[PDB]
Amino acid sequence: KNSKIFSPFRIIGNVSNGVPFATGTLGSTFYIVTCVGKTFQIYDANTLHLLFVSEKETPSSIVALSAHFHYVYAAYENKVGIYKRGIEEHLLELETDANVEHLCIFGDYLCASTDDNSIFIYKKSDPQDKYPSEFYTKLTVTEIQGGEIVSLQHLATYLNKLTVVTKSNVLLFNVRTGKLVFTSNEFPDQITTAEPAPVLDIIALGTVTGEVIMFNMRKGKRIRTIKIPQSRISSLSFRTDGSSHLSVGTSSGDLIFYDLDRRSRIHVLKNIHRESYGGVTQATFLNGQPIIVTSGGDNSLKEYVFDPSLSQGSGDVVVQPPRYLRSRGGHSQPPSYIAFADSQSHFMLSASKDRSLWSFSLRKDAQSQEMSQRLHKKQDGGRVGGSTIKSKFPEIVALAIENARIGEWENIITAHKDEKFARTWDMRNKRVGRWTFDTTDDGFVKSVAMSQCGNFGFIGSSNGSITIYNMQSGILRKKYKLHKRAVTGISLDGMNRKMVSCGLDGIVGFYDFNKSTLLGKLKLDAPITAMVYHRSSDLFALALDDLSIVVIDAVTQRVVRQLWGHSNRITAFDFSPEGRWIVSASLDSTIRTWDLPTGGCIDGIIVDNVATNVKFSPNGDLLATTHVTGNGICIWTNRAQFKTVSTRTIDESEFARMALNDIDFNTYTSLEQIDKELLTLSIGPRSKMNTLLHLDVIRKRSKPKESHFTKQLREGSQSKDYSSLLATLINFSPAAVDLEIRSLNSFEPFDEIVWFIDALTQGLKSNKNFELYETFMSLLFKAHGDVIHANNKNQDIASALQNWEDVHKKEDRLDDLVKFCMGVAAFVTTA
Amino acid sequence: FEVVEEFTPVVLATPIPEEVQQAQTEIKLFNKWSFEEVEVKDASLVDYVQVRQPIFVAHTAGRYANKRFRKAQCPIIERLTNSLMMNGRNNGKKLKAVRIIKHTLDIINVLTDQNPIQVVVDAITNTGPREDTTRVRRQAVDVSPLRRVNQAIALLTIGAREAAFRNIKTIAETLAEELINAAKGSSTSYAIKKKDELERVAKSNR
Amino acid sequence: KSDFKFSNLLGTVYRQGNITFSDDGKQLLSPVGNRVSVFDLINNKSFTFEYEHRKNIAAIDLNKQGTLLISIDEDGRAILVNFKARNVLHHFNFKEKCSAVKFSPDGRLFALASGRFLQIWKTPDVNKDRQFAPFVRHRVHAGHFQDITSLTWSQDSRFILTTSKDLSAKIWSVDSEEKNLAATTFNGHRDYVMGAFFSHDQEKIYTVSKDGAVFVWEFTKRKYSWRITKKHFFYANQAKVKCVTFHPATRLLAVGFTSGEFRLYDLPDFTLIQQLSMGQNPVNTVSVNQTGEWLAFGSSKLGQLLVYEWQSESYILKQQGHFDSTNSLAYSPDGSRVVTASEDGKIKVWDITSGFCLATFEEHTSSVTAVQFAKRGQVMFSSSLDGTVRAWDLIRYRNFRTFTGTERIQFNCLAVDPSGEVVCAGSLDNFDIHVWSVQTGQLLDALSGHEGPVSCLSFSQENSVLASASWDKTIRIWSIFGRSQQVEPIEVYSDVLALSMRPDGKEVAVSTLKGQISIFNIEDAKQVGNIDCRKDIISGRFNQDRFTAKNSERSKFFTTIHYSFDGMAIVAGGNNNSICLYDVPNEVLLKRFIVSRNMALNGTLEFLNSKKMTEAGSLDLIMRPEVRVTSVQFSPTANAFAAASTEGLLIYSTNDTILFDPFDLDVDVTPHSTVEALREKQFLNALVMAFRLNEEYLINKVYEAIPIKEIPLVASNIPAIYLPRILKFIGDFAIESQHIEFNLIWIKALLSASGGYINEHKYLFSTAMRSIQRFIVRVAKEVVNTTTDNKYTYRFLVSTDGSM
Amino acid sequence: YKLDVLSSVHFVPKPAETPTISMEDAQPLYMSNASSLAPQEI
Amino acid sequence: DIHSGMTKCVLVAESDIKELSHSGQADSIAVTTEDGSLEIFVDPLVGNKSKKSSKKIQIVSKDG
Amino acid sequence: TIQDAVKFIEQGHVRVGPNLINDPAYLVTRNMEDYVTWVDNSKIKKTLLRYRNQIDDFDF
RNA sequence: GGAUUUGGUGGAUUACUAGCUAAUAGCA
């Protein structure tokens, strides 16, 4: 299940999954923590800019979220996690299998409610500790005491009492003493929501049947009751800006505001959140402001404020209706198609079954926006034909993007389900285009493709016809007919000379776009499902119905690579930017990476949810995938982009059960020496020899206007081998080389100089690093030329020189070889 | 397989004769002769008997005296038209030349069903003197291909003209006869006789 | 083919920031404006990272491990980059003018001087995968009341010295428990404190002030407290102490003063080791090697960098960047070196590999406009607005000739005959074209006929004809050579700005003000192709502009164009933020490149932020350099091109070739199959199969696995289609390979076997052949030159008689 | 200078004891001045 | 497979499947396509992963 | 007038040689004053030619 | 029901590590 190439990064587009969000205050500002599946995200109320994300994903889905100053407390399954800045600081593990349901924290006490009507109390080890860790005691409420726990609430000024709220009634427990101090009277209707009022000794209770009760706990008696016939309360919140205003959220998606002092309805916000997804899951006033936060299960968080009254007097009577301040949101259903907007990784294009197309920015969430579907006014001047009731365009089966012509006109095509024409979009305008493209053959659109220049749009009909238009004017230019079944893929190379088509009939058509001629036709064994064309390499892969990926080279129109191993239909696949790897997803809930050079699967993954789409970044850093479940986008990091990856084929049997090294890493190192007889230079920069020969003139200009070496030399002299001295000679810096050569003894019997000649003579025999060896001996004549010449007749000096000349005489073939190559090179280029 | 670039019938508010549409299908000299099948039989005359660029009418107003070898790129029919007009009275009158040539191709097609342009090419290729003489006595010397084509056009035009200078036969028919005979290679064409005499004389001075 | 990537930046070696020595001390990291350039002195190799900031770089550091590099611009935006992978891990903003950054010597923590706030942060682990939030905070420190000038780590990674503009230096403790150990504020200075440092024993703290005062503090009895035991003062007449660095191991101080002079001192003796002057400009930064032997200094105003070996008083490294936009550029015929000319009036020669200025020429008084090489390459010609054309021999590096017009005319464009016998120049003031003899220097004739200034010039390499253009909306082809002179004028739709001429010399390309690249057949003097380019051009709204970039016409044309040496592509540049590479016979855009992404430069952005306006106007205006490409050129020997721009010479290369571009591959072809062939000794097939797959690593393996005896057999049988690739391969491999003999034997076999085919198609193979010629010239000849001289030197010492 | 900046479309720079280090050397370091002289000059 | 949970086979039809009828015990499967055609799979439970219909049936009027 | 001339400069209508100049402080040399001219697609240039009835939309 | 124009606000127009402060720590 773990990839050696990829690793999850984060989720994009999901702001809330429906769990009630928690509000915490640091100083003046306020921050909101929202649940996203197994992770939580923190947004700044000032800008709704994300501030932190959970460092790791929780093992189980989070059920309750509570935040208090810097710390955020998260409850999942039978464990409660404590996080700071998104970093877990401590984990509170409960001793019972019963899963936590509600979480309440007040002062030094942490209270957790499990599904078995058991309340666990934790306390701080130290009064000055930052969070509670120690287990104080366990309090369990029995059926006789009350019903199932609705929520855990603590009201101000109550010296270690927890105001436990149940469906049957409310109960008061002293956590310090672990005793039931008071039991509230039974209520006819089940309680659903509890919220402590800003007043002392009153808590607002919401029922199933539209009843809000401001039960005074101190008096143990009802004070007031608000009626909401035919509604179900979901959230309550009081306004702390000095106005006695109460907000009641409903599962219908409706938010109502009451004036407690005036006993009147200020205003109602209708359908702010979808009723299908739970309506208003949570709605809370910001402490001490006229602003209210709202959230729902529709993957949306909205932000409303109450403006000042327009009347100089009696402002309480003249209350402005709340006005939309800001919001963040995403798709309400899992995305159906995804695309990379630009050569960079800045903006994504996503479509979902909620009939929505969104622009999501990996770089920053705030940059994410939804493209508009307001239609431009037609050029002709007639009325548009459509329903008066505005309805959102059908789901986008396919989409194509280009940026060669961004900002000049429409750069996008999309295809809709059960629909006979293609709509355009302009990424720069983030709005629908003014051109609509029809198949003209009474067929549904099945394939949409772009030319690289961005001047041609290609539409694949279900009836086998291809229509080619121009984007700037939206006018038909050419219309081709080969396939008699639906065409499932159209691709035109970066040139626009050759276009390739594929259809369910199983044939692949090769055309000349310029001359409009059928270059060739290729028939495959099984029907085609999809195509991806790699323009840089001119290789394109096809998803066959036989559970195979067939790669074809358009230049020669031959099947070049065929991939096997998928146990079910291939949902999606993509080419790597370098065109070397292909990653495919299939209904068998596995992601496979295929290495085209060897034509084998190198990495395999098992996804819990089938990945509907897979798309590489043009940079190749990231891989984006969409699954059958989840409204967000899974982003992966390409580990290959930081280190090499072994290309060994993956074990099929091991993968099924879960459900030459230089070649393996695509590298090679040149040999130190191909052959002993062959002359080979040193392994280093070629400027060294110039530096060694001309050090003094280099050194002159630069002005402003026993030793180990000798020990090795004598050691080699007795051993008759100077390799150890030879190896170190290569290693010295040029300055060090000069000093050792100069420092060589120059007095009779001249023993040192003889061995150095012998040492260099041995190195010259090796035929490796020979050009260095010529350089040192050149320095010898420079430093000891007078010495050697003066005593040339000495047998020891003469014999050593004669031996080297014997070797050096052999190394004259290089002169013939180099000096030849210029004669032919000069001639062949010249005549 | 089929490709459709035209999804509506075309009717222009100004009427157009249908032969003009047939011309739109293919460019033909006077909308009546095709260049596609025309080839220069002799390799030497290739690259200097230019027939690959089709033209409706011989008139082009091209710049064909600017450089040395520009005359090669000229359409050969236009070269024949230019050579036809001569002798002062016909000077300046290219339109009369075009009309005369059009009559000549009509006559050639009538007499021989073969494409007249190929007849023109065959005559020019046949009549090109391959070897000549230069005064030193005389000495034999080779002949450059542009000199061949120029001299060929000259002989054909001159022979056709002189044959009809004071005779009932008009310029068009004497042309058509001379080009037909030159294409055949028969000695009847004046130009072939001159070419034979020139090459033979060079052979004597070889 | 068209897979180019930014490699290195020549013409600018240091701009601003702090230069940092590598952990090994063998590499130097110099911020170059918007990017970072790394120079490998020992290996004579250089590279510039592809990552770019949005502003110039302000502070930089490399960890002692050498794995993580952090760079911060002038807005506090920090970029973390994996040094080994040359890839970016995360991008962060500190929301403040971060003055300095420095890793802890342990490498677990890094501290930034952010205003009056010292922010200590935990280093991410390089091995760990990228996360949303890699950095983790350790503590935020604020004792200082004004912005922090600099900071220093203790060698034990426990205590920090901070010097701030509060005229105070302050010590902190990395560990909270050790706060009582070091919670002292250091005072007593007159002016700003530039630096504070620890002694090797860590018992002495040395603090330096702007006025030029060094205080040595010791923990001593008056009961024990820190006190200024000794006070040393820098005695500069007006130069202020600006930057200071200390090496505890060798007790070395380098102090750079604003006057352009630095002094080396030995503490605590204050012994002036040496004192040297870089000039009249401040020496913007100073750094020390880990040995303490090499000192790096850099000057912003002239963009100077120097690495000085105080031990030997020798100069390891010394360059300067052009204090100008490089008006022109020219490659050597072999491509080993490139020459650049600027508006200062001076011409530099740069080696592409080392990235270092080998030679410069300052004879020109005014701006040098254009530079060109002769066909031979021994000679370079340059033209300047001072009114002279100056000819240069590189062998002796002398201005061997100067040409001047009679009427004192400024010259903007130049061209040299392929024979290297006629030099021909053009002007914007004369409307005529001047010509001279290189041998004698006389003005042969003034070619007339243009009714507008000649904008640019070029000769045919083959035909020897001359093509000229002007703002007269025409192109004239001049047949100057020969008994008779003829001129062929050709009209163009709009004013002409640039010409490029095909290597064959049979077409010429022209760029017009309208934004069109038109190609014409020179011999036939008719248009044969045209490319639309106005829309591809990306031009940015200037902060001063009052009209949109879309509606702007400031630069929708290319001021420079050049063909590819193969003759199938053209690279085009202009006064814009785009370099476009088109394909000639086809007329499409193969790829486009963004020259820069620095908002410090004016024309980089098309859309500017509305916040920067006020009712007054733009805050930025409270002039900036402009993004533009002066000239472009292709590499004669390599698949690369260089573009001259304001920041410097950008070089784009295909060398990395990580892309998989197989040719004629088949199912049977596999890297394992290639090895199987080699083990079976089917050398020819293995070489063929590897080239089909087209991996550099396999081709080496096959190439080096062929025995010498089988080379002539394999070479004779190689298909013609793979001949170009092997020829390119050997040249690229050979130039840095050690197997001089092995490569040569291959060249000997290949040239002999297929010499005729090379001659038939010269230009398909020209770049590869030059690369081979570069090898047998630039390295092979030198070895035998070294070999032969010793042979003759030997013969004397034996033959001659030595006595008396 | 001042007229150049005023007349220049593009930016124009500002033109520019102790031993001084020659920032710029007109020739490579390694070449010798004797090697820069032609035999006719010698 | 109910007991094991693996995909034994994936049957592929020419057009969208609307109705499905099974004969005996995996003996034959008849599936109504959306296009108006009927496809029969013969012994689908006996390459092996992906199988195609063997017999295809259409209805067309005498007119066409 | 000069002020009318000034207003057109910041409005991006005037080109000296091949470059537009939005700065009203550029000096023009006696050589360069020949080529102080209009931008090709300037609306005014259309107005100049539309008056004299020599507009050719091909140029624009 | 269609079309034209326009005011205001919201998000971007720079790469997403919490607030506040008098900041080695306090506040919230």
Q: DSSP per residue over C472-507, as a string?
A: TSEEEEE--SSSS--EEEEE-SS-EEEEEE-TTSSE
What backbone phi and psi angles, to 5 degrees, belong to A183?
-120, 130
Chain A residues within an 8 Å CB radius of D29: 698, 701-702
Two tokens, residue C597: 């992404």
Contact A698 D19 (CB under 8 A): no
Q: Where are the beta strands (DSSP E) in A251-383?
A: 255-259, 264-269, 280-285, 291-296, 300-305, 323-329, 335-340, 347-352, 356-361, 369-370
Q: Which residues of A618-644 are buried (b: 16+ CB within 10 A; e: fewer)?
A: eebbbbbbbbeebbbbbbbbbbbbbee
Nearest to B77 by CA among B143, B149, B134: B149
| Tokens coding C303 | 């963009």
Q: In C376-473, where do the E strands start and end?
A: 379-384, 388-393, 398-404, 413-416, 422-426, 433-437, 443-447, 454-459, 466-470
Q: Tokens for B191, please give them.
A: 């130009």
Span between the terminal Cα atoms of chain B, in Å: 63
Q: How many residues make up chain E in this entry?
A: 64
Q: Give the chain A residue whose CA is nearest to the CA of B3.
A: A480
C454 touches chain F (CB under 8 A): no
With H, G, I as helix, E, B as strand and everything else as coil, classify residue C375: coil
D17 lies within 8 A of chain A by CB: no
CB contact under 8 A, A453 and C589: yes
Nucleotide nearest C179, CA–C1', reads G24
β-pairing, A179-183 with A233-238?
A: unpaired
Nearest to A705 among D19, D31, D32 (CB): D19
Could you give the CA distance from residue C200 to residue C186 in angstroms, rounded to a whole number?
19
Query: Distance between alpha carbon A480 and the CA centroid of its chain, in Å?
Result: 40
CA angle C741, C743, C749 (to 5 degrees): 100
DSSP per residue, C511-525: EETTSEEEEEETTTT
CB A573 within 8 A of CB A532: yes
3-state secondary structure of E47: coil
Helix (H) or strand (E) holding C21: strand C20-21
Instruction: List strand G contacts in C 179-218 (CB < 7 A).
Output: 179, 183, 185
Q: Is C497 on the interface with F (CB under 8 A)?
A: yes
Q: Which two tokens stand for residue A577?
A: 């930017």
Separation in Å: G28 C1' and A29 CA: 9
- What are φ and ψ of residue F23, in 5° steps? -90, 120
Nearest CA-CA distance, residue E47 and chain A, Å = 7
Q: Where are the beta strands (DSSP E) in A124-244?
A: 134-140, 149-153, 161-166, 170-174, 179-183, 191-196, 202-207, 211-216, 221-227, 233-238
The token pair that represents A421 in the structure block: 């024409």
Q: Calculate how close chain A gets to C158, using CA atoms only, in Å.
A: 25
Which amino acid type is present at position C15? R
Helices (H), A154-293: none
Task: Judge: D31–A690 Cβ closer than 8 Å, yes or no.
Answer: no
Nucleic acid strand G: bases within 7 A of protein CB: 1-4, 9-20, 23-25, 27-28
Q: Say how far C53 CA is from G14 C1', in Å.
A: 10
Report how far residue B171's alpha carbon sits from residue B85's, in angstroms, rounded to the nearest whole number: 11
**d(C-alpha C388, C-alpha C406), whole Å:** 10
Across all strands, nucleotide nearest A365 (CA–C1'): G16
The rounded distance, in Å, linking the Cα atoms of B1 and A519 is 11
Q: How far apart are CA E29 and CA E10, in angstroms?
A: 13
Q: Contact, C345 vs C328, CB < 8 A?
A: no
**Which pair of tokens denotes residue A386?**
């459509």
Buried-state track C362-391, b at ≥16 Cβ within 10 A, e below 16: ebbeebbbbbbbbeeeebbbbbbbbbbbbb
**DSSP per residue, A743-784:** HS--STT-HHHHHHHHHHHHHHHHTBSHHHHHHHHHHHHHHH
What is the side-by-side order of every strand in the sheet holding A233-238? A233-238, A245-250, A255-259, A264-269
Does any strand G atom come closer than 7 Å to the Cβ of C312? Answer: no
Q: Measure Cα distances from B140 to A135, B194, C184 in Å.
A: 124, 16, 113
Query: Which chain C residue lies closest to F38 (C-alpha atoms)?
Result: C553
- C-alpha distances (whole Å) from C335 to each of C325, C349, C639, C653, C778 are 22, 12, 11, 13, 11
Instruction: Answer whether D36 sits within 8 Å of C397, measured CB to CB.
Output: yes
Please report, rounded to whole angstroms, the spatial distance between the CA atom of protein residue C71 and the C1' atom of nucleotide G17: 17
**Nucleic acid strand G within 7 Å of C139 CB:** yes
Interface touch D7/F21, C-beta < 8 Å: no
* C421 in Cβ contact with C438 (< 8 Å): yes
- A123-154 exposure pattern, b = at least 16 Cβ within 10 A, e = fewer: bbeeeeeebbbeebeebebeeebbbbbbbbbb
Residue C241 has phi, psi (to 5 degrees) of -70, 125
Interface contact D30-A698, CB threshold 8 A: yes
Burial of C270 (0-12, 13-18, 19+ CB in 10 A): middle
Cα angle value C170/C172/C178 (rounded, 5°): 145
- Residue–nucleotide distance: A325 CA to G9 C1' (Å): 8
Residue of C315, C323, C359 lying closest to D26 (CB–CB): C359
> From the C1' of G17, which residue's alpha carbon is nearest?
C133
Provide the β-strand partners of residue F42: none
User: Does residue A369 sit in helix, strand or coil?
Assistant: strand
The spacing between the Cα labelled CA in C140 and the C1' in G19, in angstroms, equals 15
The 3 state secondary structure assigned to A49-92 is: CEEEECCCCCCCCEEEEEEECCEEEEEECCEEEEEECCEEEEEE
Spatial distance between the Cα atoms of E37 and E33, rounded to a whole number of angstroms: 5
The identity of residue A377, as a single letter, is K
Please give the residue of chain B at the shortest CA–CA distance from A468.
Answer: B5
| F33: CB partners within 8 A, 6+ apart | none
Say how far apart CA C260 and CA C237 lie, in whole Å. 13
In angstroms, how far is CA B62 from the centroid of its own chain?
A: 17
* Whole-number Cα distances in Å, C60 to A753, C16, C30, D33: 50, 11, 9, 40
Comparing CA positions, the residue from A281, A258, A287, A256 lying closest to residue A269 is A256
Q: How far apart are CA C196 and CA C194, in angstroms?
A: 7
Chain D residues within an 8 Å CB radius of A694: 30, 32
Q: Quickly give C144 CA vs G25 C1' distance in Å.
A: 14
Interaxial angle between packed helices B116-127 and B76-84, expressed in degrees from 0 to 180 and rounded to the nearest 10: 70
Three-state DSSP at C134 gives: coil
Q: Are B94 and B76 in contact (CB under 8 A)?
A: no
Contact E7 A567 (CB under 8 A): yes
The answer to whether residues C278 and C315 touch, using CB atoms and an 8 Å cutoff, is: no
Q: Is A321 helix (H, G, I), strand (E, B) or coil?
A: coil
Number of residue pairs across C and F with CB atoms under 8 Å?
39
CA nearest neighbour of C413 among C507, C520, C499:
C499
What is the topology classification, in CATH, of domain B7-206?
Answer: Ribosomal Protein S7 (1.10.455)
The answer to whether the beta carbons of residues C302 and C280 sit under 8 Å apart is no
Q: Confirm if A698 and D29 have CB atoms less than 8 A apart.
A: yes
Cβ contact C488–B73 (<8 Å): no
Experimental structure resolution, Å: 4.7
A379 CA, G2 C1': separation in Å? 14
**Count of other CB atoms within 10 angstroms of residue E43:** 11
Q: In what order do the strands lie in the sheet with C560-563?
A: C560-563, C569-573, C578-583, C588-594
> In sequence order, what DSSP letters do the residues of D1-42 get, joined into one string?
-HHHHHH-SS--PPP----B--S--SS-SSS-TGGGS-TTT-
Gap between the Cα atoms of A191 and A223, Å rounded? 17
3-state secondary structure C746-779: HHHHHHHHHHHHHHHCHHHHHHHHHHHHHHHHHH
Supply the DSSP string of F1-60, one letter for each residue: -HHHHHHHHHTT-EEETTEE---TT----TTGGGGEEE-TT-HHHHHHHHHHT---TTT-
C227: phi then psi, degrees, rounded to nearest 5: -145, 155
Query: CA C606, CA C602: separation in Å to the nearest integer?
Result: 10
A463 SS3 class: coil
As a whole number of angstroms, the distance between CA A120 and CA A111 comes to 6
Q: Which two tokens stand for residue A62?
A: 């989070």
In sequence order, the β-bridge partners of residue C360 are: C348
Nucleic strand G near CB of residue A362 (< 7 Å) = yes
Q: Rg (Cα) of chain C, in Å, rounded?
A: 30
Check if residue A52 sits with its Cβ under 7 angstroms from strand G.
yes
Please enumerate in sequence order all residues whose Cβ is within 8 A of that of C415, keeping only pairs 6 or more positions apart, or say none: C372, C423, C424, C425, C457, C458, C459, C466
